[PDB]
């Protein structure tokens, strides 16, 4: 290992001693990758061992199995689990690959060359050789593009993926004719992030998702080649700090943004996160409650269209600020929700009064009731319901877990952008250790600020 | 002493022994602090472990009953005992230690021993400061927690009908006390808890800002990337640039400290003043002199059925809290309120 | 230097000779913050009532409409808007924009931009003055909390109507409804936040008292001791060794913190970390995770429920819940 006397970094910053040790840095990164794959495999095995296909996935607190099921792999129409074996196969494969990666990390961390510059020039970066850093970026960018095209191939020629918008309760569909139109695909990124627009979180079709991943894979491969064969422009040299900690800070900012995006994706989106596996969203549960009570009071005579609430605004139906007919009550805040079980009841001007009277099918009612009883509300100790409950139900929605956890991770990695980026700037300038004490900048400035 | 030391007395031997610099300084204040504080903490632990509140609050509040660290609590005695001191030999327990535990006498035991422990701890601060010849500003600062403890655990229950309305020593019990204050006294609207909140938040702000500013204006004083090693306890030069910090905060915020003594006095001053103002407010609540309402707005709302502010909504929330918590929070009242008299919104 | 106007402009913007430091983060902080200040002042003074709950029941929050400073507030945006973007040009008229709570959204957006650029500006001045750039990291904790209570919680709950009102009584209402719907007091992250503010107060008082006591005699009586210190003293005016000895003897020897640097890092890290934790708690509860729910967790041999202090807390929560929005609920479960 190392010591503080020869490095200047204490034990609580010991990995910082690896900044200029290329081989051991590679070993550490490979070991952490092996850790990631090991958690993937072990947690997948844990979930399948604790899984009963009779109950819905979101009832049993599973996060990885919904991810595998969204890709097909043993789900029938309506999100019914047919074979749990593919989940087991995925767990075993990720686990064994993790064993291999862990051995590799151990080797490259203990016995492998400490610095790769001399013996292995192909792997000998210098943290300031801009061409070499761009080459590494290009290699890993090509790998990412290949992964995106792998997803596209899975959806195209390998059984498709689980479309929750398919007629009926949703089913595994083979996506043909992906949305490869530039305007449609790039209109999401420039779309507003507010209500009704939702930025890229509001992607609703599988065709749009597959076309977008097509564009991203192609662009990532092309950009990998470009960043391989080119050196940053002279204006790029002046704009950025060129050090390992600087690159780390840039990546930290990027992945903090991605973590926030994933949190919002899990909370709001129900296309890439079908409610059959992840359970209803917040808006979905609220709309489901309103719909269930509407159909209950409509079955008991009454006329929900003319039913006036206590505020004089409409007990079951009202008009969105734009004019679209929407469910009344507080759920008017979620009027822009769209779900597989409510779209058939929507006409050109929103919810249709005629369809809401006779076109409702029993499966829609059952799904709405189930979503209402499993709203994404829970406690820290996994007690379902609002904060004022009887501590009888054991349920917290997987969407809530994903949203909370990855939001915390996104915030902490933004703090990482701040910390590691400021330190990169200071170290490049030379202030990393403190004021000069012989030539303070402030003492060279005119008084009174 | 002054003119001459006369002869050594047994007090001199006791002082010399007690004032030795051993691992745990006892001192003269120790004879009051160590037994009282030890018994207070041990009583809290025994109560949270074995003692129950089934006969005092009709609540299970011990580990042996199935409560965890959050919900266990040394509950205050029954309201029918009033402000009885609940001595284990008193006319209530009459010597029965088990029944003294059952009656809730452990709460009075812990509260009184804790009060005398706080007195002993401030005495300890005075004694230690006098031994090392320092101005005892930390004892003056510690006067604020003593004021808070006295006003909340002693003055407030004495202003009410009994110890029953004191804070029970526990986590969830303290939370109940807080929500009770919001519901009944409207404690948030009271300007003295406002000043206390401002003091505590400003003290936290000052702590964070001073720490960050010192750690970010350090002089180099070393060649290692670990800036903690580049410091000697006996060095005379300041380890951080006061000029740089002053300039930075002057250009960022507009105003900035230029005097270290004033800065640290301000850091001492803000939380103490906040806590003392909160203590005065709690005394006022002890007398039920609560800043509950703005009469002008209540009158306007009564005359105008469409005038609404966040204050009126808070009043409605307080009303709900009181109505729905009275029945089980105050069992001595025997409030068998039918569900039709409890205030309630629509469809909730 | 360069005769170009752009170079002169960049020199002036980044100049450290300005009384207040403008920066590149400054050129976004100044306009957004000024816009937010203007709108907030004009709305707090004279703004018509706002239909916060979307039930056509406007709430008055301005001084001109019979409010004082304590009750006055800038009412959050209408629940009918939800998370929709509501700029001035979107509304048909200024009257409608005022009615639906547009000023709150305007102030919140321009203010969030302002505080982010304020943190960036703190970093920028640290870089320009040649100091370590981690005051912004400490300042991130208030920014995190403000984002949680103004942006993240509305996003999780699906409406800006659930954002904290820009006022005092509005703040208290937000706190009470939050406790009703999430049991924040039992959440371990508000526990860590409370420990953080109490520790901040404790450590501030402790450190200030120790430094003031250790202040070496450079000024005699008949005047304030502050005259002993000089802004250019460039020396420690307090005996650190005596203060460390006092603190060690007070509780137990070898209590560490003989380093001034270690002491100040601890002072920086305790409240900042705890405020980070409590802001994360607010955001997680915004995604409906709530605190511990030990209601009816203790039962006797036959099955009777034995109440605990958690049950009394639940009774208070029920009291808050059934009254927080009297007319906005048409169905038994809030879920929103």
């Amino acid at each position: 290992g190392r010591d503080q006397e020869t490095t200047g970094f204490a034990w609580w910053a010991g990995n910082a001693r690896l900044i200029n040790l290329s081989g051991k840095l590679l070993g550490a990164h490979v070991a952490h990758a092996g850790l990631i794959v090991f958690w993937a495999g072990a947690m997948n095995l844990f979930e399948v061992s604790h899984f009963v296909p009779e109950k819905p996935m979101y009832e049993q607190g599973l996060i990885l199995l919904p991810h595998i099921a969204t890709l097909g792999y043993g789900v029938g129409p309506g999100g019914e689990v047919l074979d749990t074996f593919p989940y087991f196969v995925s767990g075993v494969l990720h686990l064994i690959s993790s064993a291999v990666l862990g051995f590799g990390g151990v080797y490259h961390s203990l016995i492998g060359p400490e610095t790769l510059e001399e013996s292995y020039p192909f792997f000998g970066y210098v943290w300031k050789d801009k061409n070499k850093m761009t080459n590494i970026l290009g290699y890993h960018l090509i790998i990412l593009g290949c992964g995106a095209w792998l997803l596209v191939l899975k959806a195209l020629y390998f059984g498709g993926v689980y479309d929750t918008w398919a007629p009926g309760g949703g089913d595994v569909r083979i996506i043909s004719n992906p949305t490869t139109n530039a305007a449609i695909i790039f209109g999401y990124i420039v779309k507003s992030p507010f209500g009704g627009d939702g930025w890229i979180v509001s992607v609703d079709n599988l065709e749009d998702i597959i076309g977008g991943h097509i564009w991203i894979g192609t662009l990532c491969i092309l950009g990998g080649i470009w960043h391989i064969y080119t050196t940053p422009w002279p204006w790029a040299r002046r704009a950025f700090v060129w050090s390992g900690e600087a690159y780390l800070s840039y990546s930290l900012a990027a992945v903090s943004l991605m973590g926030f995006t994933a949190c919002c994706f899990a909370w709001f989106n129900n296309t890439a996160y079908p409610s059959e596996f992840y359970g209803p969203t917040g808006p979905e549960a609220s709309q489901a409650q309103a719909f269930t009570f509407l159909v209950r009071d409509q079955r008991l005579g009454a006329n929900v269209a003319s039913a006036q609430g206590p505020t004089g605004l409409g007990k079951y139906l009202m008009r969105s600020p734009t004019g679209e007919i929407i469910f009344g009550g507080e759920t008017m805040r979620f009027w822009d929700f769209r779900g597989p079980w409510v779209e058939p009841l929507r006409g050109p001007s929103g919810l249709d009064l005629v369809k809401l009277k006779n076109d409702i099918q029993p499966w829609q009612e059952r799904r709405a009731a189930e979503y209402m009883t499993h709203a994404p509300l829970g406690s820290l100790n996994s007690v379902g319901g609002v904060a004022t409950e009887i501590n009888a139900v054991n349920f917290v929605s997987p969407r809530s877990w994903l949203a909370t956890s990855h939001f915390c991770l996104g915030f902490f990695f933004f703090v990482g952008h701040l910390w590691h980026a400021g330190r990169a700037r200071a170290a490049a300038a030379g202030f990393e250790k403190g004021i000069d004490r012989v030539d303070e900048p402030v003492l060279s400035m005119r008084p009174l600020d | 002493i002054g003119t001459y030391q006369e002869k050594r007395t047994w007090f001199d031997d006791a002082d010399d022994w007690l004032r030795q610099d051993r691992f745990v300084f006892v001192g003269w204040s120790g004879l009051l602090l160590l037994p009282c504080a030890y018994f207070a903490v041990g009583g809290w632990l025994t109560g949270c472990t074995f003692v129950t509140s089934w006969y005092t609050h009709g609540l299970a509040s011990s580990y042996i009953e199935g409560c965890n660290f959050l919900t266990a609590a040394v509950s205050t005695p029954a309201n029918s005992l009033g402000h009885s001191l609940l001595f284990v030999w008193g006319p209530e327990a009459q010597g029965d230690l088990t029944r003294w535990f059952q009656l809730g006498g452990l709460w009075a035991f812990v509260a009184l021993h804790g009060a005398f422990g706080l007195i002993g701890f401030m005495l300890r601060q005075f004694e230690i400061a006098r031994s090392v010849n320092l101005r005892p500003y930390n004892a003056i600062a510690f006067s604020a927690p003593i004021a808070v403890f006295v006003s909340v655990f002693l003055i407030y229950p004495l202003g009410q009908s009994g110890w029953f309305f004191a804070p029970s020593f526990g986590v969830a019990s303290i939370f109940r006390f807080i929500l009770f204050f919001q519901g009944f006294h409207n404690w948030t609207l009271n300007p003295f808890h406002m000043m206390g909140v401002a003091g505590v938040l400003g003290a936290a702000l000052l702590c964070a800002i001073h720490g960050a500013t010192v750690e970010n204006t350090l002089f180099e004083d070393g060649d290692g990337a670990n800036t903690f090693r580049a410091f000697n306890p006996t060095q005379a030069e300041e380890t951080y640039s006061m000029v740089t910090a002053n300039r930075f905060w002057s250009q960022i915020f507009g105003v900035a400290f230029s005097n270290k003594r004033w800065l640290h006095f301000f850091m001492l001053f803000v939380p103490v003043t906040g806590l003392w103002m909160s203590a005065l407010g709690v005394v006022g609540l002890a007398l039920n002199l609560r800043a509950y309402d703005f009469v002008s707005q209540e009158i306007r709302a009564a005359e105008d059925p469409e005038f609404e502010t966040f204050y009126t909504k808070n009043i409605l929330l307080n009303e709900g809290i009181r109505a729905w918590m009275a029945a089980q929070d105050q069992p001595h009242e025997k409030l068998t309120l039918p569900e039709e008299v409890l205030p309630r919104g629509n469809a909730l | 230097e360069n005769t170009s106007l752009w170079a002169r402009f960049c020199e002036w913007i980044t100049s450290t000779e300005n009384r207040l430091y403008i920066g590149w983060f400054g050129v976004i902080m100044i306009p957004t913050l000024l816009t937010a200040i203007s709108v907030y002042i004009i709305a707090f003074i004279a703004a018509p009532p706002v239909d916060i709950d979307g039930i056509r029941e406007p709430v008055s929050g301005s001084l001109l409409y019979g409010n004082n400073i304590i009750t006055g507030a800038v009412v959050p945006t209408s629940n009918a808007i939800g998370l929709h973007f509501y700029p001035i040009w979107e509304a048909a008229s200024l009257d409608e924009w005022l009615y639906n709570g547009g000023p709150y959204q305007l102030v919140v957006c321009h203010f969030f931009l302002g505080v982010c650029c304020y943190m960036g500006r703190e970093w920028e001045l640290s870089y320009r003055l040649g100091m370590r750039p981690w005051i912004a990291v400490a300042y991130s904790a208030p920014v995190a909390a403000a984002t949680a209570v103004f942006i993240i919680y509305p996003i999780g709950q699906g409406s800006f109507s659930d954002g904290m009102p820009l006022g005092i009584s509005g703040t208290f209402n937000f706190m009470i409804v939050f406790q009703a719907e999430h049991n924040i007091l039992m959440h371990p992250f508000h526990m860590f936040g409370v420990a953080g503010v109490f520790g901040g107060s404790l450590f501030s008082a402790m450190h200030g008292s120790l430094v003031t006591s250790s202040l070496i005699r450079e000024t005699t009586e008949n005047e304030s001791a502050n005259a002993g210190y000089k802004f250019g003293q460039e020396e420690e005016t307090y005996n650190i060794v005596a203060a460390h000895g006092y603190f060690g003897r007070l509780i137990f020897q070898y209590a560490s913190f003989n380093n001034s640097r270690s002491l100040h890092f601890f002072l920086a890290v305790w409240p900042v970390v705890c405020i980070w934790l409590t802001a994360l708690g607010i955001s997680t509860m915004a995604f409906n995770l709530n605190g511990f729910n030990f209601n009816q967790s203790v039962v006797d041999s036959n099955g009777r429920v034995l109440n605990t202090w958690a049950d009394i807390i639940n009774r208070a929560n029920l009291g808050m819940e059934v009254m927080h929005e009297r007319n906005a609920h048409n169905f038994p479960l809030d879920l929103a």
Partner: peptide, 30 residues
């Protein structure tokens, strides 16, 4: 009339802040 008093108090506080920022006594070094 109460609104007038509140506005005056807020304006006074803001003016005091402005004067304390831009008309402060210079920090005298040594």
């Amino acid at each position: 009339m109460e609104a007038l008093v509140y506005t005056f108090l807020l304006i006074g506080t803001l003016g005091i802040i402005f004067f304390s920022i831009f008309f402060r006594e210079p920090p005298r070094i040594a």
